[PDB]
Every structure is written in C-alpha cells, then in structure tokens.
Amino acid sequence: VFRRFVEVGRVAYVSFGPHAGKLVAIVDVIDQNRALVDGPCTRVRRQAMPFKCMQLTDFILKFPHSARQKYVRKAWEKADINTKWAATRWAKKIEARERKAKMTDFDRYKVMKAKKMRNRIIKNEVKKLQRAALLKAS
Amino acid sequence: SHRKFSAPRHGSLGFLPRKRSSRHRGKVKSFPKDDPSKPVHLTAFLGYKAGMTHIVREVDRPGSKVNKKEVVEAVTIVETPPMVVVGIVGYVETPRGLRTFKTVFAEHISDECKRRFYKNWHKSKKKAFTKYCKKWQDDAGKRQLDKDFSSMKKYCQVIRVLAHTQMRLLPLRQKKAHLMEIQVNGGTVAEKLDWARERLEQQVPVSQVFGQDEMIDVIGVTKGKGYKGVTSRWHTKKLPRKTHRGLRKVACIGAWHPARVAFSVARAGQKGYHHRTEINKKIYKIGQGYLIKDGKLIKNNASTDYDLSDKSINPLGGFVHYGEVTNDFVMLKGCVVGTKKRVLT
Amino acid sequence: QVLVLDGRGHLLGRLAAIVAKQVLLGRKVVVVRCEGINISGNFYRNKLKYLAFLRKRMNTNPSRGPYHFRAPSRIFWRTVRGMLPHKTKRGQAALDRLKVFDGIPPPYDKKKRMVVPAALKVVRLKPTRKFAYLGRLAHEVGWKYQAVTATLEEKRKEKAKIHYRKKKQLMRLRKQAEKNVEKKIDRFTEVLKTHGFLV
Amino acid sequence: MKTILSNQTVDIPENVDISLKGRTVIVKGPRGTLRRDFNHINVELSLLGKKKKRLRVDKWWGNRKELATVRTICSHVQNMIKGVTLGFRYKMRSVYAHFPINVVIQENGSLVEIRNFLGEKYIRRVRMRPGVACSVSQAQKDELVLEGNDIELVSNSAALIQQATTVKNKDIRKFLDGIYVSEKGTVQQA
RNA sequence: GCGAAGCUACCAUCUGUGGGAUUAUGACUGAACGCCUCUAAGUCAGAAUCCCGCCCAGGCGGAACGAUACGGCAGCGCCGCGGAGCCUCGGUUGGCCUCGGAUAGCCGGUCCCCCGCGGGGUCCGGUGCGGAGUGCCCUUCGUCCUGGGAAACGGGGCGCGGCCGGAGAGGCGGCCGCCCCCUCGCCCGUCACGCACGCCGUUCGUGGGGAACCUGGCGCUAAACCAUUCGUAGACGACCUGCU
RNA sequence: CGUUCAUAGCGACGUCGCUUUUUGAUCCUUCGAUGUCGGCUCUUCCUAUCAUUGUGAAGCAGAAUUCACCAAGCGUUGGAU
RNA sequence: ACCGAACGCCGGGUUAAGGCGCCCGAUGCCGACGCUCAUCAGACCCCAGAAAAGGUGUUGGUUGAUAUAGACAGCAGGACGGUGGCCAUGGAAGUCGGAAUCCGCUAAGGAGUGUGUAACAACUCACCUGCCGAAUCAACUAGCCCUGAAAAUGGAUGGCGCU
Ligand SMILES: [Mg+2]
Ligand SMILES: [Mg+2]
Ligand SMILES: [Mg+2]
Ligand SMILES: [Mg+2]
Ligand SMILES: [Mg+2]
Ligand SMILES: [Mg+2]
Ligand SMILES: [Mg+2]
Ligand SMILES: [Mg+2]
Ligand SMILES: [Mg+2]
Ligand SMILES: [Mg+2]
Ligand SMILES: [Mg+2]
C-alpha cells in the first residue's frame, strides 16, 4: 500500500556506502536494481547506484528523466531541498544521533546530572497526577 | 536365507518387560473422560476376587441358534464391601503433564487406613495424621482448609477422591486396607468438589458406582508363576526328543549379524504377576450382603426370581482359599485376572 | 545477565546456530515459546523428515536407541545439541546453560524477551516460500500437550494485555506530566537536546 | 523475468459496498456479507473512486507464477460480489436406470439423506457447508437445488452429494447413477 | 481302582477397543493461456498406511501429603539477630512482560455509535529508515562541614500490623493504618577527610553455596531395616501379610 | 498382433538401464584352521504385492479379470516321494 | 598412493591446497548478478554413484509463420458436386489396403483426418464471417527442477541443519 516510489526525480537518502548520509535525486532507472543518480548540491557525482543502499524520502523534485546535471541542480535549488530536509523530523533525529556520538565525558556527566533532576521533577508530577486521578475515581 | 515356511511370531511385544509388577493393587492407568454435563459419579471401585461359579440364563440375541435357550456361563464373584472416602486430591493441567496440586485429608481416619502408612504397625506409635487432624478444630486450620478447597476450586481441573477399603469386613488375613485414588467425573469442578467434600468420612457402596448388565474393565495383577522357561513363558515349540542340550528352548536365538540378541527373541524369565487391564466384563448381578431386620437375610444373595430358595453365593464349605462372602459383591461374566483373595480394580 | 529469546517466528536451524555459539561463550540462554519456531520448506516435507528420524531405531533394543523427543522445546534442544561438542565436558557444560520451554512459563512471562533478527522468518525466507510451524509438526508426531499449552497462553496473553494497558496509561501520564511541568524543567530539557536526545 | 508492474480492476456495482481491512476484502450488500482473507497472495489491494466504484489490484515485480495470482484474486472478488447481489444456485439432477435415488433434506438444508441408491441399504447422510442450504425443487421431478452466497461452499457441497453417490466395483460406463450437477446459475438474475 | 487341593489344555471357559495427519485417488473455486484446466495462491473427501489413544514398562525427571527420633546420654524444625573458621567458586548496575504485522504498522482523541473504569467500531489529528527509538530506557560513582538559591514532604528505621493480586515451574510484588528519625536530587559559594611520596589482582552480587563451631525465643517428640510371621510371592534377594 | 484399431493387453528389428535371491570372472582377506549341504527351531528386515485395505484400467454388462498406483499392517498351511 | 608441501628444537610473521551458519580457526561483508522448490531437493579432483527417453515445471536462446486486407484459440454455420472416380468384388460410391490424385461450383470443402459401416447412411475433421479486443503460434535447442529411479540391522552432503 505504497506511498514512496522510485520515480524519476525522487530524492533519496543514501543509507550506507561511500556516499552515506547524503541526499541524492534519482535521475533515471537503469535496471531492476540499479539507478542512475545525482546529488549536485549534496556533493554526490553523477553515477549509477544500487537501490539496496538508498532509502527514499518524500521529496519528488521535477526534472526530465535524463537531464544534464545543470538542470537537476536548478530543480534542487528551486525547491530548496537542503532547507526542507533539515527541517524534517528524520533529519533532526539523524542530527540528534550524531550529537550523541560526539558527546565528551564532561558533556556526558553534565547530561547525567541534568537527567537525574529532570526525571525526578517528572516523577513527582506523575505520582501526584495518579493520586489525584485516584481522587476523581473515588 | 529367508525362513522357509511362514508362521506368525509367539507372544506379543505389546506387553513387555515381562517382569514382576512393581505394584500389587492394579493401577487405573486411564479414567474415562468427564463430559461436564451428566451428574457427578465415582468412576472406579476396589474389590476382592473371592471365587468362581456357574450361572444359568435365558439368552435374548435374535438370530442366534441360542436365542431363547438356557445357557450356562462361568462367573467370578468379587466381594466388594463399601469404600470409605478419606481424602480428595486436585490435579492441574500443565504442558509437562498433570501435576498434583493439593491433597486434603479428612478429620477422622480409621486404623484400617492408618495401617497402610506404616511398614510395621506393631512397632510404631501410630502417630500418622496426628498433627494434621488438629487443623479441623480451630479458626486458623478451618480457615486454611477452606482456602485450600477454594484454591482447588479455582485452579484444579481434575479431582480424584481418595477412598479405601473396609478390610475389617473381609475374611482375609490382612487388616491393612488399600487406599486408592478414584476420579470424580461430572459437572463443573466446584460442584464436583462440593460433592466430594460432602462424601468425606462416608461410606460408598458398590451399587452407587456400578449398575447391573454394565460392561466394566477389570484391572489387576496376574497370578504369578515364578521363573519359567521359554516354552511356558512364550509357548514356543518344544524341540524334538533327540536334542542334546535340552528341548524346552528356542534353538536359534538370532541370526549372526545384528550381533546382539534382540528384545524380540524369546527368553526365560518371570511368568506371571504382571499388571493387566482386561475389558468388557459384563456385571451379571450386583448382590446385597447379609443384613438383619429381625433375623438374617442370607437369601438376597444367590436366590433368583425363578429359584426362590434361601441360598448365599457362598458354596458349601465356603469359597475355597477365601471365606464367606458376607458383604455386597458384584458378579462378572467370565474369569478375571489374578489369584483368590486378590485386590482388584 | 540472561538472554531470553522468543522462539516464535524463528527458523529452527537458524536460531539454533546462534544459540549454540552463545551458549559456548558462557552466556546463559533461555528460549521460550518453542512451538512458535517455524522451519523452512512445506509442512509435508518436514513431517516426512521427522517420520524418517522416528524410523531410525536401535534394532535389537530400541530402549537404547535414538530418543525421539516429541515436544517442540525438546526438539529445539536436540537441534541445538547438534551444534555443540556434546560428548565433551565443555559441550555438556554449554548445554547446561541452555534452557528451553514449550510456551512461556512464569519466570520468563514477566521478562522482556529478545528476537534474533538473523534467524527470523520474515527476513530469511522469501514470502512465496512455504514453511512449517514446529507446534503442528510436534503435535502430529506425538506431542500430547499442544492444547494445554495453547490454553495457558491465552490466559497469559489476557494477563499481558492488562499489563500493557496499565503501561500505556502511565506513559500517557508521563507525557501529560512533562506538559504540566515544562517551565521548571526547561533548562534541563534544553541540555538533553544539545548533547542529542529528545529529538 | 520480473515484470515491473501488473494490475487489474474490478468495477463493483453501486448496490454493493466492499471494504478491505488491509488485504481482507469484506463484501456486503442485498443478501449478506462475505469476507475473504488474501493474506497469502501478496498484492496491493487499492480501492479507488468516489462512490467507491472500483477495486484495483496491483502486483509489483512479479515473476510468472506471482503474476497468475493477480487475476485470480480479482475473480474471487467478482464471485464474492455476485454472491452478495444475486447469489449462487447449483441445480443437480439425479440419474438412475432402476433405483430411484430417494433424496430428502432434514434440519433446514444442512442434511441430505440419499436412500436407495443402487438398491443399497446404506443411507448416505451428507452435511452442507455452513451457509449453504439444500432444497428439493418443484417444476422438475428428480432434481436438487443448492443456494448460497459463497460459491466455494456451494460447489463443494454439491460435490459432496455427487461423490457420495458413487459406484464401486462395477463398470461406470454402464452404471451411470447418482446426483450430478446439471446447471450452475444464480438465485435471481436481473 | 477311584481321587481333594494345586498346577493345567482351542482338550474347558472369558476378553481383544477410539481418534488425527494425510497417500494413491476423485473433487471444488481458479488463474497462468479473452476459453479450459484438481493447482500455480487457495479449498474438499480420503485408507489394512503413518502418529497418537487404549495397553505394558516407567528417566541420574518431577508431585502433593503424612510422620519426623523424650531420654536413660539425645538430636533437631522455624524465627531473628550476633562472633570466629575451613572449603567451593563463577561474577564486578539494573531493565517489572502487549499482541502481533510484514504488499504494513504505532499513538492519540473521540464529537458519535455498540459492548462488559475499561473492550470493539467508525471518523478525524499525529508519528513511521521507528526519539512513547534495546541506535533504547532507568540508576549514579567519592565522605563530610556550613549557608545561600532553584527543587521540596520525599526518604528511611532488614520500622512495624491489615487488605489484595499471583498456580504453568506462583515465588514475587502490590496496595492500606501507626511509631520514631532524617532535609537527602540540581546549581552555587565553604572548607576539610593518611596528600602513604608514578605502578598488579581495585571496585560489587555477598549477610553468597556447602561443612564444622558460640547466643536468645517458640516448637518437637521417629520411623526404617534386621529377626519373627505369612503365602495372593518366591532360585536367592525382592514382594504381599500378621504380631498389648 | 489384437475381427476393426501401433500402445486395453501385447510387442519384432533395434536400443538404454537396474539387481546381486543364478552362475561365471577375479584372487584382496583368512591355510599357529572363521566347523564344510540340507532339514528342524526362532527373530528381524526387504519388496521386485499372491491375498487382504483404499484406488485408477480394460478388448470392465454381471460374475470372473488381467493391467497399473499408494502400500510390507496382517497373513501366506497340512501331506505322498 | 588424491591436492599442497617434504620434517634438528623453538619465537614472530606469511602462505599453499583447502576453508570461513554452529560443531570448528575464519564473512557477525548492509558482499555483486542470476538461476532453482523437489510428497527421493542440492551441496566440490581422486570419490564412493545412474542412462536412454520424457515434462506449457520454470528460465534463457535459435529458426520460422500470420495478422487490422481484420488473426489466434472460445462461443457456432456449411463440408458439395463431375462420381459406385479407379484398382480391388470379399466388400471401400472419401473411408480393410494400394497406384492415384485433377477440374467444376467456387466462399469453399481433401477424389479425404477419423467415428463407424458388409456397403452406405449418419456423424466428425478447410475457406469465410458475428461477438469479443493485442499480441498470437509453431518447431527446435540448452540451463536448473521433476518422471524415468527397486533391497534386505536403523543412517548418514561428515553431523546438526540450511530455502
Ligand atoms: Mg516369507
Ligand atoms: Mg545326540
Ligand atoms: Mg509412545
Ligand atoms: Mg466385475
Ligand atoms: Mg491432490
Ligand atoms: Mg482433509
Ligand atoms: Mg479422517
Ligand atoms: Mg494390424
Ligand atoms: Mg565361529
Ligand atoms: Mg511398490
Ligand atoms: Mg598436479
């Protein structure tokens, strides 16, 4: 019951490989299992790329099936995909995950301390809510 | 080479390790399926083979050459004085099997029964269920019991009643009564359990359990015949007169090459005292025991509607190697397993 | 410190191999809901494969000969045993770390239990292939206690539904509690998304 | 090779209302409901149009045996639509050179006693599949009527009473007897 | 000659069972292949077969219950809290759980409808390379002092009594009264704690498992085997019985 | 051939196989010895199925029947030389 | 006895031939592209096992038709006359067999594919339409899979297993 399609001009996120963590517009479909692909604005050269390694987003920018790089660059910049991608929830949780990996040991300690308190303030709110709701039930 | 002239094999493999039965009282290996609809009842009883005799009867199978002709028919008498229920016991279904969950014993238990819990009674101080019966006369114990039944009512599926014989009432030498679990089959578990609870410390006669002209399955241990040769134990051929190293043998145990004698080859060993479950033994007559209103009622046993004498099923000079059947008895058609005096399920 | 795996949805051999190596490295493993293990190739295929295994018996004294366990748990235990050095001491020790159950009994029913996604049917087989539930197979080869195990699992699933419902209700209160409190946790919550959670 | 896409459409009539829980089409209308689970066929059951006018069945990257299912799902849906609207009426005529196969329904349709087939004392009782209701017709002397919504269940229950009345250990070219399916029609035609 | 008991004979007499999966096969719906086809997805019947049932044996496998050494020296069962002292070792935060799906799912909220605070439905709004994420969550890891802020009625006394839920191998929780004590998480100030002078098995589960030893309180008061006996048993052991 | 009709049942001239219940080849093992035929007795296994269960075939009207499939559960005897 | 490699006693490295789910050292690669489902799957020199011949099972090739002048299958309508054609009479006027083997009407039907007949008859098997709506169909060939394919203690891709 599909919503995302290997369409000409679909932007896709390259999961892994050399060009991992990059957006890429599908120029043309070569085969059952291989697409001819580009990412002018995302630092990805025109090349063939297997579907296995690319998972596909919800952004179909419009250019004709075998345009010459210049035109797909213009379609990318017209839609402002780089800004749109970053604003997406997906891109945010990628960013989140990256930050967690970068976290220094002082940073880590800071967080531990912050959570220690932050969960304690929630826990008391939850207990109170439960007892009051118990009051509503009574 | 192949065996020349075919013949079927001697004895069944579906009966072996032809060994001496570990039990003496025959185990009910499988009680019938309780359809939770018909009313509650005991499934099994525990009697004693007193002896054998004839019967005569008119027969009514139309078509036969023996239709409306009087035939004679061997019968076993099985003296079956009433059973006293002394416990109940809940079982729970598991994927492992059928775990026993909770056993409640009665308050009072007879010395008939107690006997069984000791290997030597003469020597013992007879202290069994002493600290147990305390439970039945206080707040804490009576409350603990009521919870245990209520737990059994919740969690258990199968309920068996523990009943034991009234060894007192038999001519036998032994006083040590047999206990036995008997499966209650009937309605919902609660209703079943309340019925058993009501029957506790109470008699249960035979006529409650079985009716007349009813097919039942007798379960007991066989008459034991010691070490017996292969010619007795398997009914193999006797070898001919000339055979140099004896002739009550099997000649070729096995072939050469599966170079091990098989479990399917006939060897000499224990003949008899095996556990056995015979089926479809028709109860011809449930009998009443001796009783008194002014004088004795000895008639009610072996008198019929057509004889009307004053006989007891006791033959002249008693049943041999047994005694006087004074109690209620059933009367099965044919023989049954085991020796005289033998406890019979 | 103890792997509990939900045998459901897993491939008989594929789970066994992963369990086997873990058990050899000293990890205590519990495999649960073994009847739910399912084996590639159609049902009839695997029935015949079992019925052949049943035929293998020590001709002269079958009582010694290969013990054909019917229970799905014991079947799984058998195939795991095939991937150990089970004549050695170390192999036996390893087998003793393993624990396998038909259905999911009371220590493990109230434990979150993992899934091997490398042995998982959805992943490893093509969707047009056929496979056999090791419950049915066991049932048809002798296993007595399918129905009993089934009923106990209904009760377990009902009891688990309640637990879940209460967990959901708490999670809902937590979400509301955060909304109630979001000005006096603001500069903690801020730092927990500089270093990259909550996002 | 893998076929990049194949599909079909099934135009539901405005009388019927079909709905699909994922891959489990439920068809309801004049005569009743009929559900059927195609979890095992692996297809995109779209349901498009305002007024819900057509059922569309895609099948992406199919090989030749996968693409055969596409149509069959569509056909079963057609029969499901028919069953809801018109219904199915399988007529089956009894045949005999001597022993006049005495049929008699019992509970409602359910049971079919088939006495005196080939002079046999053995009375063949035959159940029907739930929903199917046998009935002995008028306007035709030796003849049964099986009606029901779900075709599968009707046609199988016909086959039950066809195979019930079978001749053993004889020359079946000679001994042509039994109740055989003569006409597969509907309850109402329009 | 005749013959009790006892063995014993198709040479007498009695008893011998019910399901499930399907094979061959014949069928159903139905594509592939506008039709047709038992088949490709799906469905049906189906057997001296196969597996189980009944039946026999019962695992270096479990069960519930009974009784648990009065004594003439005894010896133990619980409970709680203390001191040493062999031995056996592995370990070196926890995770207290929906079901499941996969050509789909998760969460909400129902304005509205049906069922027993929930369950089911429809409708709508959110997520979905899953952030109500095991790529996860929880917990913190020096001790103390005093003297501010934000957070603040939370924690304890192996604190104490009642009411629950839990049977699959429950073995664990939960919720309610009363007594006494404390001010613990997050920031700041403020000092001090052998600072053992660069250097290894640290750091816990641990009051661990087992064996032998000193204290209190409340409980207990034997069976088994031999010998003897029996004959439903028996080669001998074993077995069934009897004995203020 | 089977009135007719290659194939119900067969099948020439040719051809491809399997089997080790025939007999040959062979000589590896055993000549400081593996007791040499048959019968009797007893168990088990195989199927290349005579009978029995369930079925497809006919040159199967019935009866009798051969041909084939699943199939080795159960059977497969008494005598004369 | 094959393949690799030829041995004083040791440390580090590196290989060969072989391997790398687990047994078992190594793929716990986000390996690449295909093929194949087997109610007897298949799985590595020597080597421990199968053939002829089949199969719209599936996958590739090769060569050819026929077709909007309206196919191809599917629903249906005719299948004649010159003519007992000739040989064969034992009957073959299409029809046990065989030499023949063309014309007319033609829209078009073979001096006939069969069924069946003593022999006919009767039936059946082009050319064309009516409906429907794009590919259709034939003969070869070679991959995997299946049939062919039967043995005696219970059993062996080394085992577990594996789609
Ligand atoms: Mg023979
Ligand atoms: Mg002699
Ligand atoms: Mg068994
Ligand atoms: Mg016949
Ligand atoms: Mg079939
Ligand atoms: Mg069936
Ligand atoms: Mg059946
Ligand atoms: Mg001929
Ligand atoms: Mg010898
Ligand atoms: Mg055969
Ligand atoms: Mg070489």
Q: Which residues, in sequence order, are bridge partners of residue C4?
A: C30
Amino acid at A29: V
- Phi and psi at C125, nearest 5°, equal -105, 155
> Which residue of B94, B154, B155, B253 to mutate against C (max C Cβ within 10 Å)?
B94
Q: Nucleic chain E: which protein residues 91-120 of C have CB below 7 A from it?
A: 101-107, 109-112, 120
Cα–Cα distance, C7 to C29 (Å, whole number): 12
Q: Nucleic chain G: which protein residues 1-40 of A have CB below 7 A from it?
A: 15-16, 32-34
Cβ-in-10-Å burial (0-12, 13-18, 19+) of B338 comes to buried
Helix C146-181 and helix C134-141: axis angle, to 10°? Answer: 160
- With touching defined as 3+ CB pairs under 8 A, do chains A and C touch? yes
Three-class SS state of B89: strand
Three-class SS state of D85: helix
Spatial strand order in the sheet of A34-39:
A44-50, A34-39, A22-29, A10-14, A54-60
Contact B95 C149 (CB under 8 A): yes
Considering only CB atoms, which chain A residues are within 8 Å of C189? 118
**Interfacial residues of D (vs A; Cβ cutoff 8 Å):** 2, 22, 44, 46, 61
Amino acid at C53: F
Cα–Cα distance, B190 to B90 (Å, whole number): 11
**Interfacial residues of D (vs C; Cβ cutoff 8 Å):** 42, 65-66
Three-class SS state of D135: strand
Three-class SS state of A115: helix
Cα–Cα distance, B269 to B335 (Å, whole number): 25
CA of D104 from ligand 10 middle (Å) equals: 44
CA of A54 from ligand 6 middle (Å) equals: 47
Spatial strand order in the sheet of D17-21:
D17-21, D24-28, D33-37
Smallest CA–CA distance from D21 into chain A, residue? A1
Put simply, whether B33 touches C (Cβ < 8 Å) is no
Considering only CB atoms, which chain D residues are within 8 Å of C128? 42, 65-66
> Which residue of A107, A125, A129 to mutate against C (max C Cβ within 10 Å)?
A125
- With touching defined as 3+ CB pairs under 8 A, do chains A and B touch? no
- Report residue B239 as tokens: 């070898």
Answer whether C75's CB lies under 8 Å from C68's CB.
Answer: no
- With touching defined as 3+ CB pairs under 8 A, do chains B and D touch? no
- Phi and psi at B111, nearest 5°, equal -70, -30
Closest chain C C-alpha to D100 CA, distance in angstroms: 43
Cα–Cα distance, B45 to C91 (Å, whole number): 51
Cα–Cα distance, C34 to B47 (Å, whole number): 46
Comparing CA positions, the residue from B339, B328, B333 lying closest to residue B80 is B328
Comparing CA positions, the residue from C185, C26, C180 lying closest to residue C94 is C26
Q: Which residues, in sequence order, are bridge partners of residue D93?
A: D180
Contact A103 C196 (CB under 8 A): yes
Considering only CB atoms, which chain A residues are within 8 Å of C176? 129
- Phi and psi at D144, nearest 5°, equal -110, 160
CA of A47 from ligand 5 middle (Å) equals: 52
- Report residue C86 as tokens: 């089970």
- Report residue A137 as tokens: 């039930």
- Report residue A4 as tokens: 């995302």
**Beta carbon of B147 within 7 Å of strand E?**
no
CA of C55 from ligand 10 middle (Å) equals: 19
CA of A93 from ligand 9 middle (Å) equals: 83
Q: Nucleic chain F: which protein residues 186-245 of B have CB below 7 A from it?
A: 236-237, 239-240
Smallest CA–CA distance from D59 into chain A, residue? A1
Answer whether D134's CB lies under 8 Å from D128's CB.
Answer: yes
Cβ-in-10-Å burial (0-12, 13-18, 19+) of C135 comes to buried
Q: Tokens 């998304």 sit at which residue?
A: C193
Nucleotides of F under 7 A from a protein CB: 39-45, 55, 57, 60-63, 74-78
PDB experimental method: cryo-EM
Which residues fall within 8 angstroms of residue A95, CB to CB, at 6 or more apart? A86, C196, C199
Answer whether B341's CB lies under 8 Å from B47's CB.
Answer: no
Comparing CA positions, the residue from B52, B31, B41 lying closest to residue B207 is B41
Residue D169's region, left for phi above 0, alpha for psi from -120 to 50, else beta, is left
Work out the angle at residue B227's Cα, subtended by the Cα atoms of residues B226 and B228, and round it to the nearest 5 degrees.
Answer: 110
How far, in whole angstroms, is CA A62 from its chain's centroid?
A: 20
Amino acid at B331: M
Q: Which residues, in sequence order, are bridge partners of residue C85?
A: none
Q: Nucleic chain E: which protein residues 57-116 of B have CB below 7 A from it?
A: 73-74, 89, 92-97, 99-103, 105, 115
**Beta carbon of B255 within 7 Å of strand F?**
yes
- Report residue A93 as tokens: 């949780």
Considering only CB atoms, which chain D residues are within 8 Å of C127? 42
Q: Nucleic chain F: which protein residues 8-47 of B have CB below 7 A from it?
A: 8-11, 13
How far, in whole angstroms, is CA A137 from its chain's centroid?
A: 44
Give the H/E segment covering residue D145.
strand D144-148
**Beta carbon of B259 within 7 Å of strand F?**
no
**Interfacial residues of A (vs C; Cβ cutoff 8 Å):** 92-93, 95-103, 107-108, 110-111, 114-115, 117-118, 121-122, 125-126, 129-130, 133
Half-sphere exposure of B214 (CA within 13 A, CB side): 15
> Which residue of C128, C130, C131 to mutate against D (max D Cβ within 10 Å)?
C128
Contact B262 C59 (CB under 8 A): yes
Cα–Cα distance, C139 to C151 (Å, whole number): 15
Answer whether B186's CB lies under 8 Å from B41's CB.
Answer: yes
Instruction: For chain C, list the strands marked E by DSSP.
Output: 2-6, 28-32, 38-40, 99-100, 131-133
Nucleotide closest in space to A137 (CA vs C1'): E117
Taking the CB of residue B321, how many other CB atoms lie within 10 A of it?
A: 10
Which ligand lies nearest to the CA atom of residue D156 in the structure? 6
Three-class SS state of C62: coil
Q: How is residue B172 annotated by DSSP?
A: S
Q: Tokens 């849906």 sit at which residue?
A: D77
Q: Which of C59, C63, C148 sits opposite B94 (nearest CB)?
A: C148
Amino acid at B173: R
Find and give the residue nearest to F60, measured CA to C1'. D171
Cβ-in-10-Å burial (0-12, 13-18, 19+) of C89 comes to exposed
Helix C72-81 and helix C134-141: axis angle, to 10°? Answer: 100
- H-assigned helices in C130-194: 134-141, 146-181, 186-189
Cβ-in-10-Å burial (0-12, 13-18, 19+) of C48 comes to exposed
**Beta carbon of D172 within 7 Å of strand F?**
yes
Work out the angle at residue B68's Cα, subtended by the Cα atoms of residues B63 and B69, and round it to the nearest 5 degrees.
Answer: 110
C176 CA – E165 C1', rounded, Å: 28
Answer whether C69's CB lies under 8 Å from C78's CB.
Answer: yes
Q: Which of D2, D22, D44 sits opposite A2 (nearest CB)?
A: D44
Contact C59 B261 (CB under 8 A): no
**Beta carbon of A55 within 7 Å of strand G?**
no
Cα–Cα distance, B200 to B108 (Å, whole number): 9
Contact A1 D46 (CB under 8 A): yes
Find and give the residue nearest to E93, measured CA to C1'. C1
Nucleotide closest in space to C151 (CA vs C1'): E168
**Beta carbon of C16 within 7 Å of strand G?**
yes
Comparing CA positions, the residue from C47, C38, C87, C92 lying closest to residue C70 is C47
Comparing CA positions, the residue from D50, D57, D51 lying closest to residue D20 is D57
